[PDB]
């Protein structure tokens, strides 16, 4: 249930700079799923948000919940499957009950934390925390629906 | 000095009369006017100022210098 | 005395934001506490659709949020300080939560993206905004945030 | 048809980011006229260069758009939308003249292509018009292509 | 100098990255010629997109190029090396005429510019010459500039 | 202070965005040693072109990471935290020597550079160590740097 | 051949932009010597960072076109110019020493790489030499690779 960058590489989708996953530490199917991303100055983001303060904008850290939340979504109903994933998307519907309380900036470890709040067929709502050292750094509820590919 | 102001706008040179005032009626750019300019110091040398060129508003008012 | 329409040079003198994370291009009309809307053109030619996704180019949701946020920001603070660059250097809109987004059209290179939102509570510091993403008159997302100005201290 | 999108645009024309200068072709007549645009956005990397604090859309680049549009016009005329004999083309420009720029294109603008064929013959294209942002000529050029195989 | 180097371009040009195309000035004759090149690298985000797997150096920033090196020419024959000026200054393309792509430039070529001045009036600068590869022409221009305050 | 964050480290280092290569300082010791580290993510450039599809961290990046933390030693040994006198100096980098290179580093890794002070003479400062991913030597290098004036 | 240009260099080595830092071979010698280069222009991103107001080359991307250069005359003296051979080996280099930086590079410069062969066994390759600008010897440095399957 630990997921590299490579893993991750073929399950979604997302490349170059929309792909704000690096690793999955903890894979509960139709359950929970623990996942991170390194924050590092070394981002094209941080030239802009903002100039001489890089903080990581609160946006992309719901948009890397909805990633987390999408590799479980998809690996829960066909496992690992690169193949399958090809011909798949989890289109986010809603997003839901965000709250930002503490600013993520370079060095942190940014941890997505996501559970199943609600799965029925191809609808899939998860929620939870963003968290450094620890710390509950931003909140969210996503609704998302497996698509085909087109 | 005639086929000069027609081949610089667009124009045919029945439209250019003494008459015609290059903005108003020839519908000149400024970028039309800066080029017009040294197209025609280009054609018989000479030099205009933008002193005199300024206040130049018709084909007149060029044609006497 | 505000005026009511913006371009990008005064965006820039009042917005933080930098490439490439300003994503409000121009503001069209401006009420000061009451509403603004504002937008943004989607082209092919931005770093973002490298991304999201080779062969498929979709302008992604959260960053249909994010240009809403900053168009509120926009309203926020000219609300308190009209025209303002120098005070704008010293002064932050602080993003607090976001709620009641959907998001029923894709966005795509070619699109011209508005942003049209209305104050539904102004208490001192903190703007609660609300409203609506729209290409060629179509409502292309919805969305509510809750925003604080403090110091860029 | 005579609307094509991103998508089409990616299926015939060779140029990727950040060289791709055309977002979409609102109307095409074969072997007469195009008309494209493409959206100005803050968001793209050459305002960080031109200029910091006053960006304005390089001239050079409205010429390129034009000559994306007027390749776009060629290749289509000749064999219409298709994308399997476009992966064995190219249009290659040979010549640009009469270009003038009469107003800045910044952003927040939509750059349009007006372009028509003035001659072609063969493979042998030349092209002209105008660029506009609401209705005014911002640029104008002229310019000549060969179509070639592609190598 | 006899020779000038990008820190020096960089006090007289106001254009950054990715839009400053000159990288030294070899030669310069106040109000009549200048010689300048720009290195051509793979490691250059305009190949991403120009064009995968077949790297091209785009025709239409070789006419920038030409340009900035007229402009640099326009700005030191106008006001000699001062780095206050330029600062308030911007350069604006306003015509191009007479261009001819003669042989496509890749990474490894050393683009030389060869602009002399074919008339100049207070702030319009008209100039014309050559690019060029190894001792061979590979581009030709002709192309005016108006030097403009940034306001 | 001990611990230094990317605040900080951009009043010190002149290097900027895509180059500066340490996020975070989590130990100095004055004229002894320097533990830094710099989160590695896929989201940055070089992971583009090295390589496609197999995401591996330069492991000359790593040796210039090295550098700039040995560099903030140096100069923070000397004259402490002093962005003024900061922008007044170089630490110009002479030689590198006996590098190893022995664990790729990939995206989610925590890249930690361990330098020690192996001689310091007049402007002429001697660092060597380590970096380290989860406690092990992933690479090694010894550097010779000079400070001077800008 | 003894001339190869940026095309034939695509199909050797797997380094793609940004970290493709050879533009052109000059001078190949099967188990002796090669000679390429890389132009250096203000043009490049790197610049953005190393220094603003000063771009500087940096030395660490020096030595990395050396590899890219001596790892591309090891591929070469073993298996020609063939690129479906290149798709199945990594030239995996270990360690680099005797680095010696004299001379800054800056935008306009042509960087020259001059590598020899030191020792070459079976698969582990020993390069050493200088990176050259206008005759003069701007930075020196030796490499040892392991060529394994891909
Ligand atoms: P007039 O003196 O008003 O002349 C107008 C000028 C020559 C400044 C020109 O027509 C103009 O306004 N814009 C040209 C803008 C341009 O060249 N854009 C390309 C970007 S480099």
Redesign the pocket.
């Given at each position: 249930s630990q997921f590299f960058i490579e893993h991750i590489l073929q399950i979604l989708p997302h490349r170059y700079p929309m792909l704000l996953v690096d690793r999955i530490t903890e894979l509960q199917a139709n359950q929970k799923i623990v996942a991170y991303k390194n924050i590092t100055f070394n981002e094209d983001v941080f030239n802009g948000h903002f100039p001489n303060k890089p903080i990581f904008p609160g946006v992309l850290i719901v948009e890397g919940m909805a990633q987390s939340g999408g590799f479980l979504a998809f690996t829960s109903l066909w496992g690992f499957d690169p193949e399958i994933a090809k011909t798949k998307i989890v289109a986010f519907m809603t997003i839901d009950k965000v709250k930002f309380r503490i600013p993520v900036t370079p060095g942190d470890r940014l941890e997505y934390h996501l559970e199943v709040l609600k799965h029925k067929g191809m609808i899939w709502q998860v929620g939870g925390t963003a968290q450094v050292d620890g710390k509950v750094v931003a909140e969210a509820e996503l609704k998302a629906m497996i698509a085909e590919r087109e | 000095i005639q086929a000069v102001i027609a081949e610089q706008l667009n124009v045919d040179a029945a439209q250019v009369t003494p008459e015609a005032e290059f903005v108003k009626d020839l519908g000149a750019?400024?970028?039309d006017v800066?080029e017009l300019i040294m197209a025609l110091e280009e054609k018989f040398g000479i030099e205009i100022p933008d002193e005199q060129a300024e206040k130049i508003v018709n084909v007149g008012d060029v044609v006497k210098y």
């Open positions: - | 750019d400024s970028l800066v």
